[PDB]
């Protein structure tokens, strides 16, 4: 329909497409290789609640998130699946991760002790994964000699469970195979040293989407697909042997149509002027919704399967488009910003290229003001308006 | 304190600075000119609930929001101040705006008739403000002959209250005096025509923030400050001295520290490498939080009042800073992304410049995941976490 209870400007999340892309990852990896769905940044702007709910039905082995509150949000909504927090959970918030049984990242002994203390205080055991810095220079142990010592102590701390150990590739998306091979070996060399001290950590993992496609050796015990679950690739230097489906459609509606003559100025600073008789539509989406202002006078959106350019500057809440070439335009016609419309697509990757970034940042730009509508087998099954 | 119950990456909102900036508008305009506080985009990322709550106590005459959902959000938190919705409320949602006495922007008879029908059905009257396009080419009547014809119809529509009439400047920020007088004159000429048809409208307004300070003639009955209320100037080219106080501080904490030698690669794609023995810190803020990825290797955050460069790529939830030259850096030290720290400011305007946009987009990019902590008179009075 033209309009409904939900805001005109919206994100349509296709849950059956996410579960499909998830099933594509299982084909690439072995039958005994576990999958951790990275759904950080609110499932890359898709809404963690619903995405986690539907991946839990699909039988996912783990979830990956960036923060404590991301991990807790999932538990608040009845997610039973194990969850791993990549980031630092401050000492002041340690009670919560122990209470709701959340896996925590650890790469120093003082922090492990503080966690153990809270684990013993609640008479539960805090699952932990050890992060190793094999080249990325971000987080994890860099002194491998120190790492062995502290990791071996943690193995003897009864308040903890030393379930996992992991690292992260620095240039897998850039396809520096020599560095990926180099990072992998360092990682395995630390594990060999630990296994020689009678310590078998059940979950060794290192591969993100880039290495999952290319580096069959990096699979290990568990694999960490993120953006790839949402119908996009991390870069152009990947094999793309999987068949991805479109998971998100960022859409809005025609809210106003005017006929104007030539020499008619549009937008702030009179940055655009018509060179002909034109039909201008206004659409209630702007930069506060996640439509980058740099697309002012250099992007085309989809309307009835035709490309329509943004004319004038992108405002905070709205922008104008030239619809002169499109016949039969009406109030409440759908306008697609990201995604497919009638044998035509303005993909998330195309948008990322135009503003010199990657699909992950584009998805994360879609703001709180944009409600998420959810679909499964073609039918709408729920919605979230964050303004509520 | 180093850490607390709130996420380390946060936005500190200073409500007394917002009210102070509002009072700066009060000094500029008369005692006889009303003030509509524009707080669309969740109060430019400050949080509409708390900001509206305090501007109401301050005695603001009206609020301006972009969308229906923003207006209902205010009403649902108990706000009684009159609220204007700038954007388009679709025919499907007209019941709500009549029920909660929200003011609706109208610029066509068909829509007026639709709004009146619901208004009559509830035995109520819908307050409306008429948008006039005088040059911006965004929304409103461009046909001033029609404008008059349809407005006189609306005056004889007993289910509508024809409270306001307004337009908007296209280049008040670029300081285009001629085009501003051109816009104003058209508006006032239209006003004069309507009076001769025996029709007066009590709330005439046109001045956005730039026109408030530079164009004294443009004050009329009401004025519409937005970005000025949040400590950012609406133009670079402004006259009139004003005392703007800093309303927002986008801050994070040091999470990891490490010593590294020269030739140490940092971040994705090995984009940065050390030229010396260095001390590098990791901070839990990324582009999913609104820190633009294009700041990778070309911005400086503030730590202990000193500038520290961002090194390597900005990740989705984190990035690294070079802290070598800063002494006594410990875990939990405050890093300011936007705002003031020890006689030193990294303003929202400076970042807007850096990523070639305007302050409003910078504030708007600060994502759902970043909690808002609120202050009044130096005391922390509350907090909101949208993950909850």
Residue numbers in the entry:
A (entry chain A), B (entry chain B): 1 to 388
Text taken from the publication that reported this structure:
Alanine racemase (Alr, EC 5.1.1.1) is a fold-type III pyridoxal 5’-phosphate (PLP)-dependent enzyme that catalyzes the reversible racemization of L-Ala and D-Ala. D-Ala is one of the key building blocks of peptidoglycan network, an elastic polymer layer consisting of sugars and amino acids that forms the bacteria cell wall, protecting cell against osmotic pressure and attack from L-amino acids targeted peptidases.
In order to understand the biochemical properties of AlrTt, especially the role of the non-conserved residue Gln360 in alanine racemization, we determined the crystal structure of AlrTt in complex with L-Ala at 2.7 Å resolution, and investigated its racemase activity by saturation mutagenesis of Gln360. Like typical alanine reacemase, a homo-dimer of AlrTt was found in one asymmetric unit. Each monomer covers full-length AlrTt (Val1-Lys383), it contains an N-terminal eight-stranded α/β barrel domain (residues 1–244) and a C-terminal extended β-strand domain (residues 245–383). Although we co-crystallized AlrTt with PLP and L-Ala, only L-Ala and the phosphate group of PLP were observed in the active site of AlrTt, the pyridine ring is not interpreted due to lack of clear electron density. First, side chain of the key catalytic base Lys40 forms a hydrogen bond with carboxyl group of Asp317’ (2.6 Å), disrupted the covalent bond with pyridine ring that is necessary for forming the internal aldimine. However, these interactions are disrupted or much weaker in AlrTt: His205-Arg224 (4.5Å), Arg224-His168 (3.5Å), His168-Tyr268’ (3.0 Å). Thus, side chain of Arg224 is not properly coordinated by His205 and His168 to adopt an optimal orientation for stabilizing the N1 atom of the pyridine ring. The short side chain of Gln360 disrupted the hydrogen bond with OP2 (4.0 Å), which is highly conserved in other bacterial alanine racemase. One L-Ala molecule is positioned in the active site pocket by hydrogen bonds with main chain nitrogen of Met316’ (2.6 Å), OH of inner layer residue Tyr287’ (2.8 Å) and Tyr268’ (2.7 Å). Presence of Gln360 and conformational changes of Lys40, Arg224 and Tyr44 destroy the hydrogen bonding interactions necessary for stabilizing the pyridine ring and phosphate group, result in weaker PLP binding and low racemase activity of AlrTt.
